[PDB]
Design a binder for this molecule. Structure first.
Ligand SMILES: *[C@@H]1O[C@H](CO)[C@@H](O[C@@H]2O[C@H](CO)[C@@H](O)[C@H](O)[C@H]2NC(C)=O)[C@H](O)[C@H]1NC(C)=O
Ligand SMILES: *[C@@H]1O[C@H](CO)[C@@H](O[C@@H]2O[C@H](CO)[C@@H](O)[C@H](O)[C@H]2NC(C)=O)[C@H](O)[C@H]1NC(C)=O
Ligand SMILES: *[C@@H]1O[C@H](CO)[C@@H](O[C@@H]2O[C@H](CO)[C@@H](O)[C@H](O)[C@H]2NC(C)=O)[C@H](O)[C@H]1NC(C)=O
Ligand SMILES: *[C@@H]1O[C@H](CO)[C@@H](O[C@@H]2O[C@H](CO)[C@@H](O)[C@H](O)[C@H]2NC(C)=O)[C@H](O)[C@H]1NC(C)=O
Ligand SMILES: *[C@@H]1O[C@H](CO)[C@@H](O[C@@H]2O[C@H](CO)[C@@H](O)[C@H](O)[C@H]2NC(C)=O)[C@H](O)[C@H]1NC(C)=O
Ligand SMILES: *[C@@H]1O[C@H](CO)[C@@H](O[C@@H]2O[C@H](CO)[C@@H](O)[C@H](O)[C@H]2NC(C)=O)[C@H](O)[C@H]1NC(C)=O
Ligand SMILES: *[C@@H]1O[C@H](CO)[C@@H](O[C@@H]2O[C@H](CO)[C@@H](O)[C@H](O)[C@H]2NC(C)=O)[C@H](O)[C@H]1NC(C)=O
Ligand SMILES: *[C@@H]1O[C@H](CO)[C@@H](O[C@@H]2O[C@H](CO)[C@@H](O)[C@H](O)[C@H]2NC(C)=O)[C@H](O)[C@H]1NC(C)=O
Lengths: 133, 413, 192
C-alpha cells in the first residue's frame, strides 16, 4: 500500500490501475445502428487523457470525448445526452439512471427514472368515496 | 384488550459483483494468458453466472417494493383521529426524506478494504437508490393510511381512519361499536407501542442480524478470494513475474499451469457459493414480496403470518439490503369465566345463538359476542329455532323474550 | 448442452484434443501422460455441468411447488389472499398448458366509477346510537342512507339496517337523524 522512498525520506502511497468493464448500450439493430458506451466505475476525467497513440487496450477510440460525455455513479457514459426529464426505464444503466432512444431528431438519451404518476388522495375526517360501477 | 406492534426483518438483496477472469488468474502477462486460452470456455460460464445473479438481485427489490401504480401523498394537515404516525412518516427537515425509524435503521447497519478489490473484482451499484426505495415506502404508507386496502385492488378510495379501523375490527370478529366507544384509549395504546419500537431495536445490538450477516458474508467471500491469490499451489513462488524471469519457458509453462489450476478452482468455488446464497436471498425476497402484498395491502386471516395475535394492519420500512414490517395486531386481555350452554329450552323449542354464546354468572343468562364481553338479553332476534329439546345434550331451562307480543298485549288492551 | 459438447474439443495442455491421434503417435509411457490432462479437464467440465443442473433443478422445483399451490388455491377455490390470484378481488381462474409450464387466466374485479360522499360513524335518534349492521351511512348532502361498502346502493335507514349500542355521548362524530321503525307505522293505522 505504501512505500518509503529510499533516496529522500518521505512516504508515498501506491494506487493500482483504474481498469473496468466496457458495456455497449444499443436499441434493436432493426431500429438503428448507433450505440452508447459505458465505462464502469470510472471517473472519465482520466479516460480522456488515457486516449493516446495506440496505448489503451480497446483499439477503437473514435468516440473519444466528442460531446455527450456524462458522469454517472455507475461509470462514464459516452454517446448519450442527459435530459432534465423522467420517463419509465427502458435500458437500465444503474444508480437510478436509465437510457432510451427517443425524439428531441432521433437519438439516444439518458435520464433518471420516474417511479410513477403523482397522486394525492383527498383525505378528510368526514368524507368517503364509494364505487358505482 | 391490548394493541401490540411487532417487527419482522427480511433481507431482500445482496451485492452485485463482476470478475475479470483473465486479470485475476494472469498478472497482465501475455503467455500465461496463452496457456489460459488452452482451457476452453470456463470463464464465460462464470461471467454468465455472475451477470445472472446481478440481474436477479435487481429484480428482487423491484418485486418487493415497486407495487404501487401511483405515488400517493399524505394531506398537509395530519390528524388521523388521535393516531399519530410521525415516527413512520418521512420528515422534510432532513436532506434524505426518510422516517426517524428508517434513519436509525440506516445508521445501525455498518456497511483499506475497498483498495484491495483491484484484481479484476468490481462491485456494481444497484438500479434503485435508497431515495427511490424510500419514496416507494412513503407511497405505500400514504396509500394505506389515507385509503385503507382499497388502493391495492383498484383506485384509491378515501375513508376516515377510525372508520377504517372499524372495518378492521369487523374483520377480526369484533363489533365496531367496541372501537368508537374506546377510540381514544385505543389510539393511546398505538401511540405507546410505536414509541417502544424506537428503543426496542436501539438497546438491543443484535436486532438487525440478518442484513449485517449478508454484508459480512459478502465481505469475507471477497476477502478470501483476494487472499487466495497469494498462495503457491505447488510452486517455488506465487509471483508470476519472478517465476517468469527466473526460469526458462519450457519448465515455466508447465509450472505456472499449477497456479492457473489453483486460481481457476478458487474462482469456481466462489461462483458456486454465490449461486447458493443468491438462491437463498431469492427465496427470502419472495417471502418479503408476499408479506408486502398480503399484510400491507390487505388484512390477513392466516395465523401467525403477519405477527402474533389477530392481524389489524402493517407498515413497511426500508433497510440496507432489506425491509422491516411493523405488524399492528389485536391481543385479548383480562378474561373472566362463566357457565355456558349449547341451547335454550323455552316452549319445547331449542334456541341456538345466531352469533355469540350463552353465558351465565349463576343467576341469569345472556348472549355475548365471542371475542369481547358484552352481555345482552336473550330475545328471538339474537337466537334461531331448530327442533325440540330432546336431542341436544346440555340444553338448559330459560326464557326467551319476544319483543313483539309485549307491545301488542300492551297497546291492544 | 452446447457448452458441454463444445468443451470436448480443447487440449487442456496436451499435444492434441483427439484421443486416437494421441494413441497412434506416441509410446504408452508418454501416451498416459498425454491422456491424463484430457481426463482431468473432462471430469472438471462434467462436474460443473452436474452442479449447475442441480442448482437449476432446485430453482424449477420452487416454481413447480408455487404453480401447484396456485392450481389448488385459485382454480379449485376462491382465495382471499391479496395479489395471489391476480389484481383485484378474485373471482375465478382457468388453467392452460404450455410447453414446460402452465398459464393461469385470473378473472377478477376492478371497481370503476366512484363518487364522493359524507359519512358519520353513528346516528342519534332518541338518545341511542345506531350503528350499521353491514354497510356505511352515506349522505348526498340532504338525506342519509345505508349502503353496502363495495357498491353504491342507498337504502332508507330503519331498525332492520342498524343496531343500538348505548347513548350518544361517547361516539365522536355522531349526527342528528331519524330512524324509521317499520312496526309502529303499520300498528298506528290498522288499530285505529
Ligand atoms: C376534521 O379535520 C380538522 C382539521 O384537520 C380537525 O381539526 C383538528 O382537531 C383536533 C382535535 O379533534 C386538534 O387536535 C387539531 O389541532 C385540529 N387541527 C386543525 C384545527 O388543523 C377536526 O378534528 C375535524 N373536524 C371536526 C369538526 O371535528
Ligand atoms: C357500468 O359500466 C359499463 C361499462 O363497463 C357501462 O356500460 C356502458 O354504458 C354506456 C351508456 O349506455 C354505453 O354507451 C356503453 O356501450 C356501455 N358499455 C358496454 C361495454 O356495455 C354501464 O352503463 C355502467 N353503468 C352505470 C350505471 O354507469
Ligand atoms: C406524535 O408523536 C411525536 C413523538 O414521536 C410527538 O412529538 C413530540 O411533541 C412534543 C410536544 O411538542 C415535544 O415535546 C416532543 O419532543 C416531541 N417528540 C419528538 C420525538 O419530536 C408529536 O407531538 C405527536 N403528534 C401530535 C399531533 O401530538
Ligand atoms: C383495559 O386495559 C387498559 C390498559 O391497557 C386500561 O386502561 C388503564 O386504566 C387505568 C384505570 O383507570 C388507568 O390508570 C390507566 O391510565 C389506563 N391506561 C390507559 C392507556 O388509558 C383499561 O382501563 C382497561 N379497561 C377495563 C374495562 O378494565
Ligand atoms: C349476573 O350478571 C347480571 C348482569 O346484568 C346481573 O343481573 C342483574 O343484576 C342486578 C343486580 O342488582 C339486578 O337488579 C338485575 O335485575 C339483573 N338483571 C337481570 C336482567 O336479571 C346478575 O345479578 C349477575 N349475578 C350476580 C350474582 O351478580
Ligand atoms: C326444564 O327442563 C327440564 C329438564 O331439565 C324439564 O323437566 C322435565 O321435562 C320433561 C319433558 O318435557 C317432562 O315430561 C317432565 O315432567 C319434566 N320434569 C319435571 C320434574 O317437571 C322441564 O319441562 C323444562 N321446563 C320447565 C318449564 O320447567
Ligand atoms: C339525495 O337523495 C335523495 C333520494 O331520495 C333525493 O331526494 C329526492 O330527490 C328527487 C329529485 O329532486 C325528488 O324528486 C324526490 O322527491 C326526493 N325525495 C325526497 C324523499 O325528498 C335528494 O334530492 C338527494 N339530494 C341531493 C342534494 O341530491
Ligand atoms: C341533535 O344533536 C344535537 C347536538 O348536535 C343535540 O343538541 C343538544 O342536546 C342536548 C341534550 O338534549 C341539549 O342540552 C343541548 O342544548 C343541545 N345543543 C344545542 C346546541 O342546542 C340534540 O339533542 C340532538 N337531537 C335533536 C332532536 O335535535
Amino acid at each position: 500500500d505504501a512505500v518509503r522512498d529510499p533516496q529522500t525520506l518521505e512516504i508515498l502511497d501506491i494506487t493500482p490501475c483504474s481498469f473496468g468493464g466496457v458495456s455497449v448500450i444499443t436499441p434493436g439493430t432493426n431500429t438503428s445502428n448507433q450505440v452508447a458506451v459505458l465505462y464502469q466505475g470510472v471517473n472519465c476525467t482520466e479516460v480522456s487523457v488515457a486516449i493516446h497513440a495506440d496505448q489503451l487496450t480497446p483499439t477503437w477510440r473514435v468516440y473519444s470525448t466528442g460531446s455527450n460525455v456524462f458522469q454517472t455513479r455507475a461509470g462514464c457514459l459516452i454517446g448519450a445526452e442527459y435530459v432534465n426529464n423522467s420517463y419509465e426505464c427502458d435500458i437500465p444503466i444503474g444508480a437510478g439512471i436509465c437510457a432510451s432512444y427517443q425524439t428531441q431528431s432521433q437519438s439516444i438519451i439518458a435520464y433518471t427514472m420516474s417511479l410513477g404518476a403523482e397522486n394525492s388522495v383527498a383525505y378528510s375526517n368526514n368524507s368517503i368515496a364509494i364505487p358505482t360501477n | 384488550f391490548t394493541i401490540s406492534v411487532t417487527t419482522e426483518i427480511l433481507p431482500v438483496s445482496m451485492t452485485k459483483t463482476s470478475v475479470d477472469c483473465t486479470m485475476y488468474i494472469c498478472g497482465d502477462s501475455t503467455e500465461c494468458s496463452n496457456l489460459l486460452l488452452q482451457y476452453g470456455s470456463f470463464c464465460t460460464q462464470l461471467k454468465r453466472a455472475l451477470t445472472g445473479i446481478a440481474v436477479e438481485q435487481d429484480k428482487n427489490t423491484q418485486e418487493v417494493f415497486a407495487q404501487v401504480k401511483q405515488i400517493y401523498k399524505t394531506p398537509p394537515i395530519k390528524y388521523f383521529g388521535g393516531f399519530n404516525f410521525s415516527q413512520i412518516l418521512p420528515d422534510p427537515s432532513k436532506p434524505s426524506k426518510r422516517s426517524p425509524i428508517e434513519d436509525l435503521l440506516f445508521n445501525k447497519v455498518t456497511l483499506l478494504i475497498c483498495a484491495q478489490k483491484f484484481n479484476g473484482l468490481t462491485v456494481l451499484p444497484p438500479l434503485l437508490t435508497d431515495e427511490m426505495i424510500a419514496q416507494y415506502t412513503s407511497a405505500l404508507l400514504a396509500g394505506t393510511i389515507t385509503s385503507g386496502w382499497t388502493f391495492g385492488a383498484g383506485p384509491a378510495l378515501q375513508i376516515p381512519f377510525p372508520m377504517q379501523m372499524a372495518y378492521r375490527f369487523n374483520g377480526i370478529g369484533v363489533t365496531q361499536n367496541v372501537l368508537y366507544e374506546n377510540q381514544k384509549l385505543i389510539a393511546n395504546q398505538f401511540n405507546s407501542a410505536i414509541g417502544k419500537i424506537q428503543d426496542s431495536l436501539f438497546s438491543t445490538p443484535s436486532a438487525l442480524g440478518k442484513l449485517q450477516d449478508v454484508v459480512n458474508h459478502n465481505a469475507q467471500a471477497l476477502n478470501t478470494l483476494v487472499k487466495q491469490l497469494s498462495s503457491k499451489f505447488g510452486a517455488i513462488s506465487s509471483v508470476l513475474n519472478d517465476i517468469l524471469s527466473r526460469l526458462d519457458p519450457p519448465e515455466a509453462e508447465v509450472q505456472i499451469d499449477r497456479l492457473i489450476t489453483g486460481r481457476l478452482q478458487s474462482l469456481q468455488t466462489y461462483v458456486t457459493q454465490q449461486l447458493i446464497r443468491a438462491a437463498e436471498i431469492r427465496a427470502s425476497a419472495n417471502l418479503a414480496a408476499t408479506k408486502m402484498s398480503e399484510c400491507v395491502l390487505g388484512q390477513s386471516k392466516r395465523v401467525d403470518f403477519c405477527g402474533k395475535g389477530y392481524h389489524l394492519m402493517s407498515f413497511p420500512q426500508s433497510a440496507p439490503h432489506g425491509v422491516v414490517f411493523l405488524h399492528v395486531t389485536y391481543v385479548p386481555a383480562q378474561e373472566k369465566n362463566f357457565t355456558t350452554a349449547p341451547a335454550i329450552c323455552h316452549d319445547g323449542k331449542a334456541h341456538f345463538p345466531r352469533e355469540g354464546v350463552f353465558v351465565s354468572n349463576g343467576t341469569h343468562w345472556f348472549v355475548t359476542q365471542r371475542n369481547f364481553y358484552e352481555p345482552q338479553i336473550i330475545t328471538t332476534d339474537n337466537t334461531f329455532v331448530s327442533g325440540n329439546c330432546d336431542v341436544v345434550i346440555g340444553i338448559v331451562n330459560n326464557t326467551v323474550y319476544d319483543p313483539l307480543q309485549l307491545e301488542l298485549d300492551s297497546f291492544k288492551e
